[PDB]
Design a binder for this molecule. Sequence first.
Ligand SMILES: *[C@@H]1O[C@H](CO)[C@@H](O[C@@H]2O[C@H](CO)[C@@H](O)[C@H](O)[C@H]2NC(C)=O)[C@H](O)[C@H]1NC(C)=O
Ligand SMILES: *[C@@H]1O[C@H](CO)[C@@H](O)[C@H](O)[C@H]1NC(C)=O
Ligand SMILES: *[C@@H]1O[C@H](CO)[C@@H](O)[C@H](O)[C@H]1NC(C)=O
Ligand SMILES: *[C@@H]1O[C@H](CO)[C@@H](O)[C@H](O)[C@H]1NC(C)=O
Ligand SMILES: *[C@@H]1O[C@H](CO)[C@@H](O)[C@H](O)[C@H]1NC(C)=O
Ligand SMILES: *[C@@H]1O[C@H](CO)[C@@H](O)[C@H](O)[C@H]1NC(C)=O
Ligand SMILES: *[C@@H]1O[C@H](CO)[C@@H](O)[C@H](O)[C@H]1NC(C)=O
Lengths: 166, 320, 208
Amino acid sequence: VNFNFNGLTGTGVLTESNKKFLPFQQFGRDIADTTDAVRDPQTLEILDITPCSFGGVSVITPGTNTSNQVAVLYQDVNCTEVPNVFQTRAGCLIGAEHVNNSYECDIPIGAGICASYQQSIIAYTMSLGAENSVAYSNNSIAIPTNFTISVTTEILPVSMTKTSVD
Amino acid sequence: CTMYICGDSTECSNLLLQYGSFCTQLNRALTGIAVEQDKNTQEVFAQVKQIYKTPPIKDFGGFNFSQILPDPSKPSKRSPIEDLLFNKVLICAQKFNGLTVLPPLLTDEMIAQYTSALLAGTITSGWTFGAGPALQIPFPMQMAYRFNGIGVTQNVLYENQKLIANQFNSAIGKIQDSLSSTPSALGKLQDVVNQNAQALNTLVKQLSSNFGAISSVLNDILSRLDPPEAEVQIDRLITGRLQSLQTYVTQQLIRAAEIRASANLAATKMSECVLGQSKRVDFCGKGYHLMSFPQSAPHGVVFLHVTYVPAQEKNFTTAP
Amino acid sequence: KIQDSLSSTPSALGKLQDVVNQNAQALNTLVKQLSSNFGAISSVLNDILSRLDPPEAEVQIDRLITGRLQSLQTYVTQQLIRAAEIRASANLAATKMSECVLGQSKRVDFCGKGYHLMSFPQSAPHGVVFLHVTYVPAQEKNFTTAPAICHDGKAHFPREGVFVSNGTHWFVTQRNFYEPQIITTDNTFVSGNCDVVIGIVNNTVYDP
Ligand SMILES: *[C@@H]1O[C@H](CO)[C@@H](O[C@@H]2O[C@H](CO)[C@@H](O)[C@H](O)[C@H]2NC(C)=O)[C@H](O)[C@H]1NC(C)=O
Ligand SMILES: *[C@@H]1O[C@H](CO)[C@@H](O)[C@H](O)[C@H]1NC(C)=O
Ligand SMILES: *[C@@H]1O[C@H](CO)[C@@H](O)[C@H](O)[C@H]1NC(C)=O
Ligand SMILES: *[C@@H]1O[C@H](CO)[C@@H](O)[C@H](O)[C@H]1NC(C)=O
Ligand SMILES: *[C@@H]1O[C@H](CO)[C@@H](O)[C@H](O)[C@H]1NC(C)=O
Ligand SMILES: *[C@@H]1O[C@H](CO)[C@@H](O)[C@H](O)[C@H]1NC(C)=O
Ligand SMILES: *[C@@H]1O[C@H](CO)[C@@H](O)[C@H](O)[C@H]1NC(C)=O
């Protein structure tokens, strides 16, 4: 709601407060020194005031070279207040199908969840790599037979265009 | 920023639009910072492509790694020291002005899995897991390679293997006790947490400043004044809040740059101290490098560096 | 394989392309800020001077000066921080040039993934590309090992390698490449006896 409590105005959701206001206190403020509590002017009831649920919208997508299908992430907003709905740590992720199978991270979601296009968009808990139990014992050594030579390419920035703004 | 500077106000947002993209290059810079932090994390921890595991029978030389290797009974498969480190070391009010906090991509359980894989690899394979397929090698023989690396013959190790294992065990116990006792030991991470808490608390507290306006409350300004006067008072508030936000972002970019340098040092130490054996003096601890162990910590990494240090003195005469 | 990988994968040079894109965006944003009013009645300086007399023109121009100067200061600050990161990258590239190209490094994963043999510099737009040649172990084979050999009651230790468990035939081989050799007094040394070392296999030694 949009409220006006004896001149105090703002937008938010009104809930019952558990604050122990003293008989003379009419409203409260947070550490930020903004209003966060009000005593109702007609019934001497104490209300807590918080703003209405909000959050960023991120679009999870493969490139337009491949598909025009997208998924939308409402960051840190519960699935219920949002209006293939998948709840995760970052929030409610709608349009991506959740599958247990883990894969390499393609599009990161956050908190261990990554997304990829596999065709459709899927969401999953990321794999950290293949498992490899080492055959350890107190008396066993492995030694390479045929060996290989590998060439790795490393690319580093060195300079940037030298602009001059009079 | 559209919430930090003109929160829940369409008229204010329309006035802010007269300043173009200052609001979008600051948010772009902060998005870049978040991406940069995730990049720093995987450069530090995602240096092994396989998650290595130790055998069920932890017979690793009489050297007790139970302290740094994960304990299954505790939920989070952290080491005892790692659990100790994590135990040792407004968001609504902030969010309400549009300054939210994004979760890290890698949770503590995956960071624990990376540190577990790196430590298990070091223990069961020496440095071979970091340069190709992991070879298995007995831990005592691995110790023999590290002794040869520091210029000490293998026989010193084999003749004194029991004392070396006992001295190692007490050094590990000493690390556990030192971290458990001294609260200031993790000051390097606590100062970063405090600097970010202060930066956010200062930025948020700047919203209580008038900046020359008759009132700091945007709803009160719009509730009291009509457009011909409200535009000047709001413009004054826009100037003050935008300057404070620009200062905040600049402070985050410089602090992030220092964190980036620290991340490069941590990644270099991970590769050179953990995935190998370094001959660089005082790079990986004070002494002659034998091996190092990574440990997970809140927003950071802790290295346990095992070094060889000469003790008792005895004089001899020499000749060329 | 390097030629084909670079020819095929467009994103391979993302590290240089992101820098080019960041500078293009910084300049495009700075230039686009000139179309902003910053509170003035018009973004065009010629239009302000053509419609208003000097006493008022001074207030509207001062408003434009404040907005354009703040945008330029923001640009320069962004270039100083980006330049500082580029400076750090340049120090890393110069260190890699000296240590990877003008020598042979023993620092693991500094100059590519593997055991460093050599590196090659290559020119690139506003940057450098390094081709790192590394040695990587491939095929696996299991052997049983032992810490020492007890010959005449003395403990023999290898100077350079690790003992291989043929089955019938303990041999010593260089650590990173299987090359078994006959156990002799020329590839082992003697220190102490077999009574203290944990695991000695008492195999036979030869005195060529
Ligand atoms: C080691 O591996 C290489 C392959 O990587 C083998 O080389 C091949 O040898 C055959 C003849 O035996 C040739 O026909 C192939 O063209 C070779 N391939 C390449 C790419 O070199 C080599 O034989 C192996 N050697 C050992 C010691 O097993
Ligand atoms: C008017 O306000 C008083 C408190 O001042 C309250 O007790 C009373 O019930 C209210 N009456 C009406 C008409 O709501
Ligand atoms: C979202 O709302 C539902 C229904 O009230 C609740 O069961 C669930 O726990 C909520 N989740 C979060 C993240 O608060
Ligand atoms: C994933 O695992 C959970 C828990 O066992 C199960 O309820 C769910 O049906 C599984 N989903 C898939 C894709 O198999
Ligand atoms: C290692 O330390 C723990 C400490 O609780 C102890 O219980 C255990 O017996 C020690 N020995 C080994 C090799 O596990
Ligand atoms: C090893 O050699 C010593 C001395 O000859 C001998 O006493 C001992 O029994 C031997 N152990 C074996 C056969 O492994
Ligand atoms: C062991 O040595 C024998 C002696 O000829 C040789 O024939 C054999 O290939 C070697 N390897 C094994 C597994 O015995």
